[PDB]
Coordinates of C-alpha atoms and ligand atoms in Angstrom, one line a residue:
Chain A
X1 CA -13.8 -8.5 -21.9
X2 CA -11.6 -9.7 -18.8
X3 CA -9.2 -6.9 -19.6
X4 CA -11.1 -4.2 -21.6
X5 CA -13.6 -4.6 -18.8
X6 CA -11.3 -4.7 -16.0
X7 CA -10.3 -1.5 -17.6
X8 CA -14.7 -1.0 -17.4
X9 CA -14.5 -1.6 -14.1
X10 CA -12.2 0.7 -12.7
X11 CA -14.1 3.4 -14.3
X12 CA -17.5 2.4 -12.4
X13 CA -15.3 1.9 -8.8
X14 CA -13.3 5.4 -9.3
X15 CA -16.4 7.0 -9.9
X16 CA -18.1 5.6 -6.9
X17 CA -15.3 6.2 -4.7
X18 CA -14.8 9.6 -5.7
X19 CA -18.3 10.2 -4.4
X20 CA -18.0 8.0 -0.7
X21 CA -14.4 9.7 -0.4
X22 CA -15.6 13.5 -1.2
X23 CA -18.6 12.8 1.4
X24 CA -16.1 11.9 4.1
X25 CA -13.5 14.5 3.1
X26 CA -16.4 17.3 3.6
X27 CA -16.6 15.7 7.2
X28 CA -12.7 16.1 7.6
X29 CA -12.5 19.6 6.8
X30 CA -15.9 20.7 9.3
X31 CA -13.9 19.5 12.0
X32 CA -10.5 20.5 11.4
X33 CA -11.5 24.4 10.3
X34 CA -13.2 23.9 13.9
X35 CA -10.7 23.1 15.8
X36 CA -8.2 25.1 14.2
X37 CA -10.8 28.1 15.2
X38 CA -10.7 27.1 18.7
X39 CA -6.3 26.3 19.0
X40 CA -5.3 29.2 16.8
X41 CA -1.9 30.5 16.2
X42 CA -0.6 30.8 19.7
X43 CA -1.8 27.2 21.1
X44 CA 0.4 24.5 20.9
X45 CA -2.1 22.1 19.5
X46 CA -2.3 24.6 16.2
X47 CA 1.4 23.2 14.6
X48 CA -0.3 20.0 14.5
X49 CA -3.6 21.2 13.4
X50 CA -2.1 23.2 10.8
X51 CA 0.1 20.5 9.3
X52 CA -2.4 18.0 9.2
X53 CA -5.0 20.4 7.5
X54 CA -1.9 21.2 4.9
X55 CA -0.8 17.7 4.3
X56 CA -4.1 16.9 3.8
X57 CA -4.5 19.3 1.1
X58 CA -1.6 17.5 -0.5
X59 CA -3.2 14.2 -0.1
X60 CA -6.6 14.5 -1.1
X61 CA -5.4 16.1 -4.3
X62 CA -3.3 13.3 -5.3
X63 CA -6.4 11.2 -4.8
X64 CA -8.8 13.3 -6.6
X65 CA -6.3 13.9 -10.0
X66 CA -6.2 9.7 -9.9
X67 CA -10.1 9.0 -9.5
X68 CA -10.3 11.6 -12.0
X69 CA -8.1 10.3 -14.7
X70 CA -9.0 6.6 -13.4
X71 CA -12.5 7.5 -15.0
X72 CA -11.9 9.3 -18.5
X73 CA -13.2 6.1 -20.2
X74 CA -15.0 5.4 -23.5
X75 CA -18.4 4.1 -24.3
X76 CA -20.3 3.4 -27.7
X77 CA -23.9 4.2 -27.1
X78 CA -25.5 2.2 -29.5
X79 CA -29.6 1.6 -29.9
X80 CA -30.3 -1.8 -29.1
X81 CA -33.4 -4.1 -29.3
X82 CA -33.9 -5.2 -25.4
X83 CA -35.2 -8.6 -25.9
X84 CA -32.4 -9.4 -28.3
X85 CA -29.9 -8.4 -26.0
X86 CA -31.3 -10.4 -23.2
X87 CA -31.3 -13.5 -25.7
X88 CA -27.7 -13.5 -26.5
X89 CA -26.7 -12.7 -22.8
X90 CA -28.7 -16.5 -22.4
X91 CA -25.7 -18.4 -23.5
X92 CA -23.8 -16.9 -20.9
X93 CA -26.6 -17.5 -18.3
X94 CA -26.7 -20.5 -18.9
X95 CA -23.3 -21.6 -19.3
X96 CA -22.4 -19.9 -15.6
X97 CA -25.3 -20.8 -13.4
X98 CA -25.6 -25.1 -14.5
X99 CA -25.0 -27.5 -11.8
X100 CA -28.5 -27.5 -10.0
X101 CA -30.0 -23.5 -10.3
X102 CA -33.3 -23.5 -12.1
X103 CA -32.9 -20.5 -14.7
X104 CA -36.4 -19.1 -15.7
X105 CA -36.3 -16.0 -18.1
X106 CA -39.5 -14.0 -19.1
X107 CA -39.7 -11.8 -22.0
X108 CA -42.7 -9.3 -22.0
X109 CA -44.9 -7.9 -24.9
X110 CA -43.6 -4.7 -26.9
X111 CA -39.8 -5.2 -26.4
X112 CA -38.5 -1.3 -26.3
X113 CA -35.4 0.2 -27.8
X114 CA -33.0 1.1 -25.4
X115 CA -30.0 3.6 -25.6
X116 CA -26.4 1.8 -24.0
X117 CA -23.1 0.5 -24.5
X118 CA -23.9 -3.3 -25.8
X119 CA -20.6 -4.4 -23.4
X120 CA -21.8 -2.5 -20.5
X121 CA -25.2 -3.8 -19.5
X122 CA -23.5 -7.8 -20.4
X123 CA -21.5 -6.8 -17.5
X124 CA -24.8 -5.5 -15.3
X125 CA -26.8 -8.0 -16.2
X126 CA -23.9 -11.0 -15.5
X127 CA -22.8 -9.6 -12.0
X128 CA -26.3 -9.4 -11.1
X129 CA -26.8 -12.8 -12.3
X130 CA -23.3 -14.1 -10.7
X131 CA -25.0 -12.6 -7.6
X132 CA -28.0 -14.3 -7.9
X133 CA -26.2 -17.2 -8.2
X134 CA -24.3 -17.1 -5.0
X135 CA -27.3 -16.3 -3.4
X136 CA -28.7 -19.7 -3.9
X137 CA -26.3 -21.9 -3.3
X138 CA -27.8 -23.2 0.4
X139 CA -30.8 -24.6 -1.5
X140 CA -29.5 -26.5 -2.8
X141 CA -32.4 -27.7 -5.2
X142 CA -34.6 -24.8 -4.6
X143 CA -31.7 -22.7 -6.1
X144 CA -34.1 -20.6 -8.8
X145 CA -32.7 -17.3 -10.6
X146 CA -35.4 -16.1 -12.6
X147 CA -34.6 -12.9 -15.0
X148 CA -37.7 -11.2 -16.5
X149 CA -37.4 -8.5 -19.2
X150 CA -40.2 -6.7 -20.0
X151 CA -42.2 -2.9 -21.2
X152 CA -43.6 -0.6 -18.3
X153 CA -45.9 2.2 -18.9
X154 CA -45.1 5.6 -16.6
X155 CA -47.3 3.9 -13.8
X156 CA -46.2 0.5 -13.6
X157 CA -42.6 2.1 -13.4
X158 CA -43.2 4.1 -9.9
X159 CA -44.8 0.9 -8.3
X160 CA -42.7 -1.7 -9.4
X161 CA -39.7 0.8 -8.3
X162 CA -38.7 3.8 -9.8
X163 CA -40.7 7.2 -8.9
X164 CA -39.0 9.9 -11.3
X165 CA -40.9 7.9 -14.4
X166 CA -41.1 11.0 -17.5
X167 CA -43.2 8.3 -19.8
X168 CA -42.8 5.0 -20.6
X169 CA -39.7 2.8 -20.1
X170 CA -37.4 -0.9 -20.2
X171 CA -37.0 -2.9 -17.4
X172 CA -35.0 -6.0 -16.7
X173 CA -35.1 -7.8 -13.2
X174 CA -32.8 -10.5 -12.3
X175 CA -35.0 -11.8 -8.8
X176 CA -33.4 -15.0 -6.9
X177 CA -34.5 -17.7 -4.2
X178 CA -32.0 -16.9 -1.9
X179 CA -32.1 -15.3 1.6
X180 CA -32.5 -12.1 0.5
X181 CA -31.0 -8.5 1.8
X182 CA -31.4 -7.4 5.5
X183 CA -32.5 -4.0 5.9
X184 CA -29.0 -3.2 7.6
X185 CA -27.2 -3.5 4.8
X186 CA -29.7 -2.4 2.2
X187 CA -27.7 0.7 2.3
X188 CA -24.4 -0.2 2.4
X189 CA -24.8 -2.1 -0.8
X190 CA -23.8 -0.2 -4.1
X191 CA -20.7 1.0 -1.8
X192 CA -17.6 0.8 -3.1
X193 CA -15.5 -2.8 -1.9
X194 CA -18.2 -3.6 0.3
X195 CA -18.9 -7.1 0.8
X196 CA -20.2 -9.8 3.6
X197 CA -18.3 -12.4 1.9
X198 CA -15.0 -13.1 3.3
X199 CA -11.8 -11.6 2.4
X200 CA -10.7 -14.0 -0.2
X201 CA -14.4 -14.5 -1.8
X202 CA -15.9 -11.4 -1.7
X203 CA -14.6 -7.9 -3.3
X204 CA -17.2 -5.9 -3.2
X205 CA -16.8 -4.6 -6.8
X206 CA -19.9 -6.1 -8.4
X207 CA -22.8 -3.5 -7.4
X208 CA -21.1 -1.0 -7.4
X209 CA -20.1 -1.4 -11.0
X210 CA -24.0 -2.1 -11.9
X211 CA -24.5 1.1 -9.9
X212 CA -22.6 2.8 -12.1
X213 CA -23.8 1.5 -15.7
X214 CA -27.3 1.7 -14.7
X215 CA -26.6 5.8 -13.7
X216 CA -24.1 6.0 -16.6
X217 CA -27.3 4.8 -19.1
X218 CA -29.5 7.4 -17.7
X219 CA -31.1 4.8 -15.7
X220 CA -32.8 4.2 -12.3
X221 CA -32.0 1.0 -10.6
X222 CA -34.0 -0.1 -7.5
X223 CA -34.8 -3.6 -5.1
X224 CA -37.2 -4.7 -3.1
X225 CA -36.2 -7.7 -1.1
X226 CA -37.6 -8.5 2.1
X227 CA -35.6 -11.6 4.8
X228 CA -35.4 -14.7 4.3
X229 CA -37.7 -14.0 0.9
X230 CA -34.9 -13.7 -1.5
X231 CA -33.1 -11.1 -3.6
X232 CA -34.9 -9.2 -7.0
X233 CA -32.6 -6.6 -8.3
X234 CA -34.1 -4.2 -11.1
X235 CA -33.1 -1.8 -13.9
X236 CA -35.1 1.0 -15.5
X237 CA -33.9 2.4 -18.5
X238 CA -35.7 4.9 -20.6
X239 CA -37.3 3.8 -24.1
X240 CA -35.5 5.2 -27.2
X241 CA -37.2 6.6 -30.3
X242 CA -35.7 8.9 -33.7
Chain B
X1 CA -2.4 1.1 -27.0
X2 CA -4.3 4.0 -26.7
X3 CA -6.8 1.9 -25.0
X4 CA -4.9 -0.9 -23.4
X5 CA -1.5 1.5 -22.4
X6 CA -4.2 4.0 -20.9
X7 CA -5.3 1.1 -18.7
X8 CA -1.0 0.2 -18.3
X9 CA -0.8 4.4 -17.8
X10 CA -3.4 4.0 -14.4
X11 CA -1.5 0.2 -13.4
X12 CA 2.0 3.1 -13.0
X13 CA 0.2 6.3 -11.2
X14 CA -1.8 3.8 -8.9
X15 CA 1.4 2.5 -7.9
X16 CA 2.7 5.6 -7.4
X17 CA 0.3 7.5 -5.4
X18 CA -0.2 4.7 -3.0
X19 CA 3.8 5.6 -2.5
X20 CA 3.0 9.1 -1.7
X21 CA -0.3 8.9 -0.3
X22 CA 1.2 6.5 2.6
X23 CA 3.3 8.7 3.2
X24 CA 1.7 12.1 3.9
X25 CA -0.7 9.2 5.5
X26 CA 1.8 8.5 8.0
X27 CA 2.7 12.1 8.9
X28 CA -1.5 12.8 9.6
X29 CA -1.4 9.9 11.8
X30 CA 1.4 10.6 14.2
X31 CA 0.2 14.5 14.5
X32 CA -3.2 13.5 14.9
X33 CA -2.5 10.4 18.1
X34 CA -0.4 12.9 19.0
X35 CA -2.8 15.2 19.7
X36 CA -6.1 12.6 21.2
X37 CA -2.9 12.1 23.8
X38 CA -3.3 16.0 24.3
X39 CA -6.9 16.0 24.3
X40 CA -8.3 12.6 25.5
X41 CA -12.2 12.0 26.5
X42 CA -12.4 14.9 28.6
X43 CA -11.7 17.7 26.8
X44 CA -13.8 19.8 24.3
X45 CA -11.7 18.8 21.2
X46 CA -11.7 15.2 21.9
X47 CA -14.7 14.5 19.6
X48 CA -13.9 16.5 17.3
X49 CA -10.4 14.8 16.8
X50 CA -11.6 11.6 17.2
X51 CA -14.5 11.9 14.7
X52 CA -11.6 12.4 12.4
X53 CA -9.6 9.8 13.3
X54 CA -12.3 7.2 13.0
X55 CA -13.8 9.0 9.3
X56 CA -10.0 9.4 8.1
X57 CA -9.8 5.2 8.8
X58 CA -12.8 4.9 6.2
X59 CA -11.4 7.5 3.7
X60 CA -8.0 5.9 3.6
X61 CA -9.6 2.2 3.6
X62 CA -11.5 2.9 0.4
X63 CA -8.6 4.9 -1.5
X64 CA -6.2 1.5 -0.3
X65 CA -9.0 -0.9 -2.0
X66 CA -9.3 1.2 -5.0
X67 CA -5.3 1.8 -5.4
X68 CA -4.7 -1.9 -4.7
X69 CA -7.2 -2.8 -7.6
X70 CA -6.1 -0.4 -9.7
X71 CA -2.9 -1.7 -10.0
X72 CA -3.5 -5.8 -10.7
X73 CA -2.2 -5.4 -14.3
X74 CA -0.9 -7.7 -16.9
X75 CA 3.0 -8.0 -18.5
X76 CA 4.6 -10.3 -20.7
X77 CA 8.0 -10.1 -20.1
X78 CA 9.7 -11.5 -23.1
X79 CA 13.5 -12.0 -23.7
X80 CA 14.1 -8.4 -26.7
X81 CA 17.2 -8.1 -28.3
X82 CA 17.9 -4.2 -27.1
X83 CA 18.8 -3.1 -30.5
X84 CA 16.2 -4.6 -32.1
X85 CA 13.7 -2.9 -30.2
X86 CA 15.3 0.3 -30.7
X87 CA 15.2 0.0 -34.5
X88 CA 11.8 -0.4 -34.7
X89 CA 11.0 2.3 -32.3
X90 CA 12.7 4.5 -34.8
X91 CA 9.6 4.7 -37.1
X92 CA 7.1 6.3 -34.2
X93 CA 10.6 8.6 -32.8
X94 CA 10.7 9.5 -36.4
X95 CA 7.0 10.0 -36.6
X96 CA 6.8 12.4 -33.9
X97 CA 9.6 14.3 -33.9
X98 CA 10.1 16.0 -38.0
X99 CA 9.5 19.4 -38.3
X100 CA 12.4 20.7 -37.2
X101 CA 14.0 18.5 -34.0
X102 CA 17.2 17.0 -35.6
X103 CA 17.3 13.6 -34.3
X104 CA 20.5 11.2 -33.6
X105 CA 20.4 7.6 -32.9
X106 CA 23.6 5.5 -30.8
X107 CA 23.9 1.6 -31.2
X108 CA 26.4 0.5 -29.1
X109 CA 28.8 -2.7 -29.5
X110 CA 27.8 -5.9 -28.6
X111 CA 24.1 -5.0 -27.7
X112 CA 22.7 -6.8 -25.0
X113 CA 19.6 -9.2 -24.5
X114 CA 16.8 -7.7 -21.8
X115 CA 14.1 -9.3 -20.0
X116 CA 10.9 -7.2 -20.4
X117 CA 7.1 -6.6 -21.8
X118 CA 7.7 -5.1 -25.1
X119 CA 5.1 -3.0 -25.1
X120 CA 6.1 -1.1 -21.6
X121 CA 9.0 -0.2 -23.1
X122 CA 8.3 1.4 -26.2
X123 CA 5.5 3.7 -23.6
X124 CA 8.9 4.4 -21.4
X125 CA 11.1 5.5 -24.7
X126 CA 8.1 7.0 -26.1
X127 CA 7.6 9.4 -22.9
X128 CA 10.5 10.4 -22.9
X129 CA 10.6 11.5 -26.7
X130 CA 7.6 13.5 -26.0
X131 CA 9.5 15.1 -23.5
X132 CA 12.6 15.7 -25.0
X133 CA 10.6 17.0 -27.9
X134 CA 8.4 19.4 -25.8
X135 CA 12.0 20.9 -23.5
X136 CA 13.2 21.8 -27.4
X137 CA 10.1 24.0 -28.9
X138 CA 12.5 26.9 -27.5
X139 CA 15.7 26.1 -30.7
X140 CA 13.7 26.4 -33.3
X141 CA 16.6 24.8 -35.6
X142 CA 18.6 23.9 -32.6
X143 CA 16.0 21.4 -31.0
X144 CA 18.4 18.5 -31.1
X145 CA 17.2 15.1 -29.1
X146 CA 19.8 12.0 -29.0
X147 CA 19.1 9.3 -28.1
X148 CA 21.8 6.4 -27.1
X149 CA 21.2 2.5 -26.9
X150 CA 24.3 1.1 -25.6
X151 CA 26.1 -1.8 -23.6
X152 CA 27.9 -1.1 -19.9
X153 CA 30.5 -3.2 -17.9
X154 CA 29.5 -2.9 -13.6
X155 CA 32.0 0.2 -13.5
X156 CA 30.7 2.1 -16.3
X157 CA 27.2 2.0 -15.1
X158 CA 28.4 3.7 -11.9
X159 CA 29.6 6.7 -13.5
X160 CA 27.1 7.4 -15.9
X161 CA 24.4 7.0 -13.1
X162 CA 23.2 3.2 -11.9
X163 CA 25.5 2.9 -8.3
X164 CA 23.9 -0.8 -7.5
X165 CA 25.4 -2.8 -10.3
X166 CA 25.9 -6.4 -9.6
X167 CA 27.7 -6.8 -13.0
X168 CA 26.6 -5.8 -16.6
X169 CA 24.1 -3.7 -17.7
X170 CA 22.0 -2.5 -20.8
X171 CA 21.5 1.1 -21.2
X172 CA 19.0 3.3 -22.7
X173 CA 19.7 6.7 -22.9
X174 CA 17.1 10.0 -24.3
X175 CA 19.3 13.4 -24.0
X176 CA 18.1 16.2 -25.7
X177 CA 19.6 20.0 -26.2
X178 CA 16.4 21.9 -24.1
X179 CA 16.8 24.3 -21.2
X180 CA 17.2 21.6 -18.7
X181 CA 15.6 20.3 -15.5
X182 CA 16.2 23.0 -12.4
X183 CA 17.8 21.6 -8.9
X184 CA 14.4 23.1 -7.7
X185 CA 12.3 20.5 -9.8
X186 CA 14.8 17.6 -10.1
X187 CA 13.4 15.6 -7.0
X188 CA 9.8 16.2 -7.6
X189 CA 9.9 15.2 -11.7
X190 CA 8.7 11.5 -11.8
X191 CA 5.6 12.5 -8.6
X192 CA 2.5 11.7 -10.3
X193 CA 0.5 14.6 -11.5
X194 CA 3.7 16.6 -11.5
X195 CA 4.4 19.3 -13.7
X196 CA 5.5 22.7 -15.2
X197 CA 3.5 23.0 -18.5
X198 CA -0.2 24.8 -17.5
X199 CA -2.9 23.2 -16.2
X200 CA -4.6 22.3 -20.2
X201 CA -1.0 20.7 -21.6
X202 CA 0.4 19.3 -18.6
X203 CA -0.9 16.3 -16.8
X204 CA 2.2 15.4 -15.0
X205 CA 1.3 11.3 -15.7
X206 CA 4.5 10.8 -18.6
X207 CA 7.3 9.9 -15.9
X208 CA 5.7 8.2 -13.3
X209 CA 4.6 5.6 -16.1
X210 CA 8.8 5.7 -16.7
X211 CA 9.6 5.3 -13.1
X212 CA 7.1 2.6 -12.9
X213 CA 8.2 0.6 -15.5
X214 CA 11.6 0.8 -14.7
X215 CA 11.1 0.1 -11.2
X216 CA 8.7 -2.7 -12.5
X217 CA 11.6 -4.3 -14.6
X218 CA 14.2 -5.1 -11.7
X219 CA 15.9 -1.4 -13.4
X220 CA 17.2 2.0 -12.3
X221 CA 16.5 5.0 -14.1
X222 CA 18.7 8.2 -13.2
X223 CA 19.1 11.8 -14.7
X224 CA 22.3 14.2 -15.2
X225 CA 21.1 17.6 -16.4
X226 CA 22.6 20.9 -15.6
X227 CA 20.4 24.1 -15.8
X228 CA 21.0 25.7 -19.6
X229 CA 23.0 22.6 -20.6
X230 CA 19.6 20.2 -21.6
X231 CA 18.0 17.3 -19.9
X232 CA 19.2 13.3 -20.0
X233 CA 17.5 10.5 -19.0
X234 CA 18.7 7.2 -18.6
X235 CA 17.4 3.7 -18.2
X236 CA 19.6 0.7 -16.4
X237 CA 18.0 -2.8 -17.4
X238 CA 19.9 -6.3 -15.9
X239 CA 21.6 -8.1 -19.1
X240 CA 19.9 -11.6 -19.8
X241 CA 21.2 -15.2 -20.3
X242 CA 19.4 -18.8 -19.6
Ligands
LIG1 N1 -28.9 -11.7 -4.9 C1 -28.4 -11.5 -3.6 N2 -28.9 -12.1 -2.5 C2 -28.5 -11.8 -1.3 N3 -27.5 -10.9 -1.0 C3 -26.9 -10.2 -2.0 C4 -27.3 -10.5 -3.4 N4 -26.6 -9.7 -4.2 C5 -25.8 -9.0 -3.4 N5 -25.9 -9.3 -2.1 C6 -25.1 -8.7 -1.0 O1 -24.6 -7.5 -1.4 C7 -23.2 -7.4 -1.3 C8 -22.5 -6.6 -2.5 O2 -22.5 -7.3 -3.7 P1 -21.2 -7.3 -4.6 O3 -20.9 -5.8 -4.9 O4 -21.3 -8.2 -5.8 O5 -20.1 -7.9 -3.5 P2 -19.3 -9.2 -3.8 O6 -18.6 -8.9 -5.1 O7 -18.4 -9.5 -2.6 O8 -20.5 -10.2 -3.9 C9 -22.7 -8.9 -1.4 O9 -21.4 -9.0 -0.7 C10 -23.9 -9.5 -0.6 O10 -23.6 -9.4 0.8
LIG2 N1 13.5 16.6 -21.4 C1 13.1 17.5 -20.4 N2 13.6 18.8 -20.4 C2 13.2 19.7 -19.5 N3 12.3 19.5 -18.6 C3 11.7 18.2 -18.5 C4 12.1 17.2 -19.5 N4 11.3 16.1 -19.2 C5 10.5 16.4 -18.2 N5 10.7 17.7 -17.7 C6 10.0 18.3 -16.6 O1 9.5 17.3 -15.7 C7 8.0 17.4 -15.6 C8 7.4 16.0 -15.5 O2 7.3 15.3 -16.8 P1 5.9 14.6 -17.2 O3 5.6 13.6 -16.1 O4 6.0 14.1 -18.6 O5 4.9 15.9 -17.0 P2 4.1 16.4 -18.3 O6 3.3 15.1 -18.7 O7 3.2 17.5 -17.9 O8 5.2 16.8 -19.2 C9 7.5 18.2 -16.8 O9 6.3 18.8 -16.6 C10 8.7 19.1 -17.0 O10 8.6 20.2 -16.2
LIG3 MG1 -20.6 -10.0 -7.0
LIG4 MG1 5.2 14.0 -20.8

């Protein structure tokens, strides 16, 4: 669990980059098959253009055969009751937040079954909370994470977040006091390494690895925060029945 | 150790990617500030050039961050009595060898103590079983792998392969009697994603996990092979006393 899920966590990363890096490499080759249109063969500037274009080649392909063996990693989908999940997970909770953060959890009526790897959404749900956690620390005794499983019929989905809603479906939200998300970096959030904490604090791992689960569990994951209002990150997962 | 020496396996090709990687990086760089000089603000190409320049700073950063992380992996180097190891070994070289490969096993005179993670070497040894079983499907009845634990004074190291020896030196050794490693091939063998054997067999990961573990225990690794005459690889490990 601190190395099988370092092991976790490369997989979510890898997979994330893989998309960023194929996104910019696109942009690359535009340009370059441009330019090599307008310096062709006989311009001096085409050696250059041409060796760059074919050690790039070489250079992305290394890359892509890592990300893509970096993935290639295992998960037990098991069904699991969603409010006794969440009740285990407590402990943990708990025993990270103490100090002064007011915990407040909230378990709805009609607890679903949910389809996931047990170790998987642990890790979701404790870098969200970890988050949550950091978020708060300026109010210092206002800090208040509050966590609120719960049911949501195929309406209460598309309002509360989540617009692609088949039927009905489980939902977890871990919300926070803090100063909440500016709409500049709403965006940039779920990206790979990044981070506005500094250098030796932040890594910028965390969101992108709950990106990942959340996607990897057939889920939709979506926020609403607004300034100075505090952070509320949620998770839609689809209900399971057999 | 299908699990945890598949996380080891990513800790090696991470390490050696970022090796190549920075440098075909290198080579796109120089070309590419060689050519804005050509180019500058003015000229057509200009944006173009630059556009890559500034997207190819984001592309690298994020393969950096995720090679970096990638790596951060976990040894144990213990104090192993080089024969001892070997012995045990013996079962899993048994194991997957039979069938036909004849197999001969070398313990040297006075066999040295070794600082390393136990469990990195057995992966080393075991690659290069595979190997050496693999370069001898050709003999059916002649496929004949040896391998050959043994002790070496500073001189005797140079010879056989290790031409930085302070003093002593432990030596591992798997030859076999395959079709051997072409001059061709012989520099590009431990690249990651390297190899001969088509696209569904081959992955080319087996000896850059060797050359990274080697590397990783203060060791040299070095290959005489001749074309027809079978491959031989060698591990050089520093002696231990305290
Ligand atoms: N609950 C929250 N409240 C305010 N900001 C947040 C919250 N959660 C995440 N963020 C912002 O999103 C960024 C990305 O999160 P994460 O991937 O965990 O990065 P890090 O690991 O450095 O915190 C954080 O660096 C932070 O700037
Ligand atoms: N014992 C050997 N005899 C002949 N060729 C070899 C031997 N070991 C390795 N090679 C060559 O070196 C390449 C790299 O080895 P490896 O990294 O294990 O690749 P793979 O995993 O595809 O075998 C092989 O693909 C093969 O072409
Ligand atoms: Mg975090
Ligand atoms: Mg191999």
């Amino acid at each position: 669990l601190s190395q099988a899920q370092k092991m976790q966590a490369i997989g979510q990363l890898a997979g994330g980059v893989a998309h960023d890096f194929n996104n910019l490499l696109t942009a690359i080759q535009l340009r370059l098959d441009e330019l090599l249109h307008r310096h062709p063969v006989g311009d001096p500037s085409y050696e250059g253009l041409n060796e760059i274009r074919q050690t790039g080649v070489r250079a992305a392909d290394l890359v892509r055969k890592l990300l893509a063996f970096s993935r290639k990693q295992t998960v037990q989908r098991e069904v699991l009751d969603l409010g006794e999940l969440i009740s285990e997970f407590e402990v943990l909770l708990r025993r990270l937040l103490r100090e002064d953060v007011k915990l407040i959890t909230d378990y709805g009526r009609d607890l679903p079954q949910v389809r996931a790897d047990k170790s998987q959404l642990e890790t979701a749900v404790m870098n969200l909370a970890v988050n949550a956690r950091d978020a708060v620390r300026a109010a210092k005794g206002g800090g208040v994470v509050r966590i609120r499983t719960a049911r949501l019929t195929r309406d209460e989905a598309i309002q509360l977040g989540f617009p692609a809603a088949d039927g009905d479906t489980a939902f977890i939200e871990v919300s926070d006091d803090g100063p909440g998300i500016p709409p500049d970096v709403m965006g940039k959030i779920f990206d790979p390494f990044f981070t506005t904490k500094p250098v030796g604090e932040g890594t910028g791992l965390g969101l992108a690895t709950v990106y990942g689960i959340v996607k990897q569990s057939d889920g939709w994951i979506h926020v609403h925060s607004r300034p100075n209002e505090g952070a509320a990150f949620r998770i839609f997962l689809p209900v399971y029945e057999a």
